[PDB]
Amino acid sequence: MITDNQVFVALIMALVCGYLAVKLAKQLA
Amino acid sequence: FSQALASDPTTRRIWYGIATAHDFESHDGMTEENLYQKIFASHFGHLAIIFLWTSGNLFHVAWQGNFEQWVANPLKTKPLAHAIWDPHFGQAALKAFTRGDTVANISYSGVYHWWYTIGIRNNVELYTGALGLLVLSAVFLLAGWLHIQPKFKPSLSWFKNNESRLNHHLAGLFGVSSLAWTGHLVHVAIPASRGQHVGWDNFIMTPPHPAGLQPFFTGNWSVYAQSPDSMQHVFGTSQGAGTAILTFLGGFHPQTQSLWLTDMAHHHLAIAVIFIVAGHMYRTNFGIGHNLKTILEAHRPPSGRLGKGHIGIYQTLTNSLHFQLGLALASLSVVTSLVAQHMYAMPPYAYMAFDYVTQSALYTHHQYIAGLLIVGAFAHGAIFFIRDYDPEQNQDNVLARMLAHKEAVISHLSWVSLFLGFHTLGLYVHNDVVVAFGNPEKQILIEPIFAQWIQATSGKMLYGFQVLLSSSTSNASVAAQQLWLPGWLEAVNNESNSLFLTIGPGDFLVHHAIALGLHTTTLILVKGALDARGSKLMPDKKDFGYSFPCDGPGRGGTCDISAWDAFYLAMFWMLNTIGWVTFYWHWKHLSLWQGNVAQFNESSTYLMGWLRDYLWLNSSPLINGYNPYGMNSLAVWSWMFLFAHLVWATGFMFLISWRGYWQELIETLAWAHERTPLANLIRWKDKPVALSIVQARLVGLVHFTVGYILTYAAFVIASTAGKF
Amino acid sequence: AIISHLNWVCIFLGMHSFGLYIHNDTMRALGRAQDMFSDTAIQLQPVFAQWIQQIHTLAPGNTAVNALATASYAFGADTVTVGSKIAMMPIKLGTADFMVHHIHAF
Amino acid sequence: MSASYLPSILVPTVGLILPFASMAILFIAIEK
Amino acid sequence: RDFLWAQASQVIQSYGSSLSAYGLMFLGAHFVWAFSLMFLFSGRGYWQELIESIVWAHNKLKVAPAIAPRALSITQGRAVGVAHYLLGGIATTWAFFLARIIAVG
Amino acid sequence: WPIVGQQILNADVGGGMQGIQITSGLFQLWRASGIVNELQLYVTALGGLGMAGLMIFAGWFHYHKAAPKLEWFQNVESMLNHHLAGLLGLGSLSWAGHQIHVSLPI
Amino acid sequence: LTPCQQSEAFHKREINEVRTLENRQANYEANSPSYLALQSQIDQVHKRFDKYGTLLCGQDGLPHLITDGDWRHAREFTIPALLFLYITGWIGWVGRSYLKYTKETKNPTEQEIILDVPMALKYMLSGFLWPLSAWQEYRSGQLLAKEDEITVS
Amino acid sequence: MIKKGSLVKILRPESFWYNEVGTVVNVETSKVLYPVLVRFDKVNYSGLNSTNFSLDELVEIKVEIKSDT
Amino acid sequence: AHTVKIYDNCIGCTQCVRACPLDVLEMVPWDGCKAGQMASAPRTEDCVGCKRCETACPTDFLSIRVYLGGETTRSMGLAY
Ligand SMILES: CC1=C(/C=C/C(C)=C\C=CC(/C)=C/C=C/C=C(C)/C=C/C=C(C)/C=C/C2=C(C)CCCC2(C)C)C(C)(C)CCC1
Ligand SMILES: CC1=C(\C=C/C(C)=C/C=C/C(C)=C/C=C/C=C(C)/C=C/C=C(C)/C=C/C2=C(C)CCCC2(C)C)C(C)(C)CCC1
Ligand SMILES: CC1=C(C/C=C(\C)CCC[C@H](C)CCC[C@H](C)CCCC(C)C)C(=O)c2ccccc2C1=O
Ligand SMILES: CC1=C(C/C=C(\C)CCC[C@H](C)CCC[C@H](C)CCCC(C)C)C(=O)c2ccccc2C1=O
Ligand code: SF4
Ligand code: SF4
């Protein structure tokens, strides 16, 4: 129970990895 | 993502996947254009790391340190760097780690400041500039990515041009940043010098000299040299100083930093002149003039026939990146060893003559990196001879004539390596054996009269045996002794400074040994590049590349035959030879710090004096970092010295025993994996294999290097800070 | 199977016997960890093989009626024979004999 | 300065989560 | 710290006495031991490329021996390597076990 | 010897003779053998020369002069009956009968 | 750096070395024959210092010397201890080279390197005046070689 | 066309044995690209004696006939 | 995997398949040699590259070359 902003940063890092896969799928955009 | 390396159902794929990750010329689908492009991007991704790490160096000094308490009393206050925080550390050791000024645990600074300058006090100052440096580094990276984007790529006619940035990049960097550097060091850091604080709003309003510009504009005389400065000086109080553009002493200044920023200001004046004389030389050598000959891509000219131009034939040197790297890491290495040699006789820092631990850490740092750059230059030179050389084009010159008779050169180099050994080490064995028998006088002592002549050049007028600068009446001595020679003679006639020390036996025989090791190292670095396309043991060596195991264990054996094997052999000599130079240099200061110079020139003649007085006596405060009683500050270092001998000896696992034994053992481990119940459900991905014959020696060289580096990185700090 | 058994035995006797060396050398340079290791220093050492020496102390007379002395004075406790210089001593194990004996076994 | 009130109290996880994250990220990359 | 360090006071501080040979052999056994580091690390391929240059100098003056100069065998190099790693790796402790025990005898 | 100043190795041991100290246990073995006078050293040495020569004239006998067949070596049964009884047995008995009549001089 | 007959800091080393040797010298009885040789050994010690004093020697007591070619010190380098090494070594080397010239012929080359007739080893004494004759024969070696070397390809 | 048993000089496009003196073991008319085997005294690292060689290789080594007294 | 390339120095003394462990090479009738055999390696996919034919290869410079290439399960000689 410490560092709430760090928890949000770890969560957004996992979401950025998922969005990276989505970016690979989009490609042309 | 290399496909040929991808189809490798073993763990080895990852190793080269990181080992050949920077090996861009051997990736799959590699072309001529993409090589320079991605390597250019790595240049920009490398300088960005340098500036990010510089920003961190400045950030931790701003956030932690007693530098404001240091500028007042810089001798007594021991310098600090960054705070230490570790829940593993015992309180008994942290009570000794915290000493000096701060209350928090802070380590001892080793990287002593080069940019002395002012300090900008402590009011929202250094972390802002560090953030600006970091953001400039990031934008530098983003600018590289901007160049990578389509339609914004520079063509090959931007790197491979005699008429290109070889002109404007040269005369433009250390020239604009020369007038800027001079104008922003001797005037921006003139408050640190004298105390003439100037806000960044009126550079014109604040002239340091009594008169500015107008005396310089006159062609008769600068009217700036007729101004001396008093010896008494403080950063805040001038103490009788009479400002001048040039303030040369010619001698050891009271404050160790330069000569009142003389040397400093003279640099970029000379460097700007270096560009004024160079930027005009090669500018017309280029001319941006396309060749009139259309015999280079037309239908009319086919086949080989003739070259593109008798003067133009230099594409093998400009097209190849390994040759350009072999020269960029070579000339910089010449200047690197020169820079290292110019940090003990001409110290540009203040209070280095009074400091002890910090000085011994910077010289050997640049010394080891000098040896590194030398090896990198020669390794890429070998790669240039393998993947880029062509005997059909460079025929009839002197470069192709070399390797038609190079065996004679290798013979002379081998003879030198044997000669300097049988006598240097032979003398050493005589020294030890005759000193052991109780007869140090029977020892065949040696006197480097050549190196003693350097002391005669210092202007001593009491010698009297027809040596240089032995009489002030000689016209050669009278010539140009009007201004700076008075400080010269006064600065060298002292046993307290390091301007040309005394030289004798224990001083010569090590220089003889350094010549031995360096000449041997030179031969080893050169022959590996010469016999790179082929030899008598293996003439098809060109039919592979740089990193390959062997040709086959037959015909006597081809163990360690590739050019990469020559590199892996060369690194061993690098560490030991560059360690000989340091083992020698570590006595030329600890002998005078204790004042007992009679220890060296009397005991260093034999190796036993090197064994008992250095590897044993100086290591007392090192090993006594954490005695079985009260551990103190030198604990972390006394631990590293052990962790070093671990990592170093860890390399002996990868170097003494080869790879097949590990194959036969890993197969037993894999058998036990699936045969064991419960654990049989767990399955891997890439098949477990041992390291490659090339990667084995490379990783073991990594251990033999970093373990040896830490072996000497822990002894210096503790042994020098234990006795001072 | 033979070498697989010996392999795991070697690794267990290595990651501990020399592992404990890394451990203790860490505890000292780290600080107060070696201080709290003293109770463990009482462990292992004088825990095993101590009773073997005590067997040999009481071996004469009891399990050796025709012997008026032990196998060697390295067994007899507090019994020291000196001829101007010490000949043998009741080798009181302790501190790190369990350490070096397992470096040996490794 | 900050002493024991600003950034040094959040460092414990900063100096260790990036190693764990880096090994995890590179392992996910090689698993691809 | 207390073992390999305090022993130099009985092996080196003996030149003024009669135990000087155990210091020379001590410092000279490291020589042959590190001389084993020449064979246990390098390979016959590079050294065989090293002879043929010397044999070229030997063919320049015809001073090349009839017995064709070749490198050591791949197995013989390791046999000599362990021979020196042991000889240089025993004579040091041979000089050490015979160093202190005479001074503290 | 005095050639190159090496006479510093002559350790002052005492007994009117200087030289190099020995750690081979020769003096302890000789004292445990009852040897006192120097004459008993030379007689043993001259008696060792004879046994040393006889073995050269033996290894040169069963070969260039004689030679047992191959059948003489499969007698491992007859070999252990002479190594455990002729060498180990008579050896442990011959030296036993010595230190019973040579113990009292020590 | 002054010579040791005038360097007061060198004779003190002679006194100090004999002083360290004297404590070992006095513990034993001088009348014993096995230790009467120590006086002859210290006689060798004494007879050694006087010759080195003539050579310029370090003020510290560590006796230095000259290799620049100075005619006053040619005895430490140039003439004696140097030229004889060159001659003696090369008297062996050019003798070996002459044996290399006679290393061919009909009898096997391996037999004429190793199992040589002792007579060639007895002829070794031929080279009294190597210099220029050896230079002629080494010219002929390079000549008859006719640049016949290894490929290095 | 030259007679067998001639003293050879190796000028093979690959093996730069710059005129290593050797003798022709035999001459074969089978007509291939690398036929001639010669006694090569310089025992290569492989260990054998005679290897195959081209038609280039040797032209002549005596160079004289009647002026060679 | 590995890349097998046969020189023109072949004498056809079958030294390859004699030495060779898993029979990478193969003797084929040829019209330009003394004995009349030539070594050919069809099963280069199964080649391991142990380099034991260059030992038995007679010629001054060997006649059977195998340049080191990629590594697969067939070329690593592993049983798992
Ligand atoms: C001025 C002066 C002087 C003089 C000098 C002289 C007389 C000269 C010189 C100089 C020099 C002379 C220097 C140098 C250096 C060098 C180096 C450092 C080298 C190098 C080389 C290289 C680097 C190479 C590389 C490569 C290879 C090997 C491979 C391939 C190719 C290549 C090229 C890449 C003096 C000092 C006396 C004094 C002061 C003044
Ligand atoms: C030191 C030495 C030496 C010298 C000398 C010698 C050699 C010795 C000896 C010795 C001897 C000389 C020994 C012995 C032997 C003996 C014996 C071996 C015995 C016996 C007896 C018996 C066996 C008995 C039996 C019986 C009977 C019959 C009766 C009843 C029963 C019974 C059983 C008791 C030398 C240097 C040379 C070398 C070696 C060592
Ligand atoms: C142990 C050993 C192996 C086996 C090596 C293996 C299995 C590598 C083990 C690595 C493990 C997974 C730990 C790796 C982590 C390191 C502690 C640090 C690396 C982290 C980064 C620097 C990459 C060889 O393959 C070998 C080959 C040739 C000569 C000697 C040897 C040898 O001694
Ligand atoms: C030096 C070296 C060689 C060459 C080793 C040689 C040439 C051994 C030389 C030893 C002899 C004894 C020296 C030559 C002396 C002659 C016998 C002449 C002696 C005549 C009188 C002095 C008696 C290898 O073959 C080798 C192989 C694999 C890894 C490393 C190496 C390696 O380091
Ligand atoms: S590296 Fe290994 S496989 Fe290659 S020649 Fe050497 S021992 Fe043989
Ligand atoms: S190794 Fe070469 S010469 Fe021998 S049989 Fe095979 S192809 Fe022919």
Ligand code: SF4
């Ligand atoms: S490459 Fe290896 S497996 Fe293939 S034929 Fe040659 S020796 Fe045999």
